[PDB]
Write a protein that binds this DNA or RNA. Structure first.
Length: 92
DNA sequence: CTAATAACTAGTTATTAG
DNA sequence: CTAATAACTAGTTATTAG
């Protein structure tokens, strides 16, 4: 109704932490590039729950984990062991 | 024409406010 | 839902700079 229509504001996600925890196992079962909406269907299979903002989440994942990369528009990849931040040793 | 700033187009859901 | 502000990918068009 009234003239005070402009109300909102925002910050990066907190529900998005559900994507971090599921996406690590979702991505470790692959070693190849995937689109946001294909990785969404894969995380929906992995977790059984809804998918927060893919662009903000996947860049939050990248800045925390250089093993994750962005080859194209909404297209992402995870290289090898995500534990490579402290797995300085060879593979088993 | 190559480079940077600015406005606009096409894509994607969140979280705050009510 | 209504309403905006938010964080991010990539390209066309236009002005300023060279």
């Amino acid at each position: 109704g009234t003239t005070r229509r402009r109300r909102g504001t925002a910050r990066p996600g907190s529900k998005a932490a559900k994507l971090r925890e599921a996406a690590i196992k979702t991505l470790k079962r692959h070693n190849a590039a995937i689109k946001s909406s294909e990785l969404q269907k894969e995380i929906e299979k992995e977790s059984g729950l809804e998918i927060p903002n893919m662009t903000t989440f996947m860049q939050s994942l990248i800045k925390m984990y250089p093993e994750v990369k962005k080859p194209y528009r909404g297209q992402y990849i995870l290289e090898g062991e995500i534990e490579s931040l402290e797995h300085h040793h060879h593979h088993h």
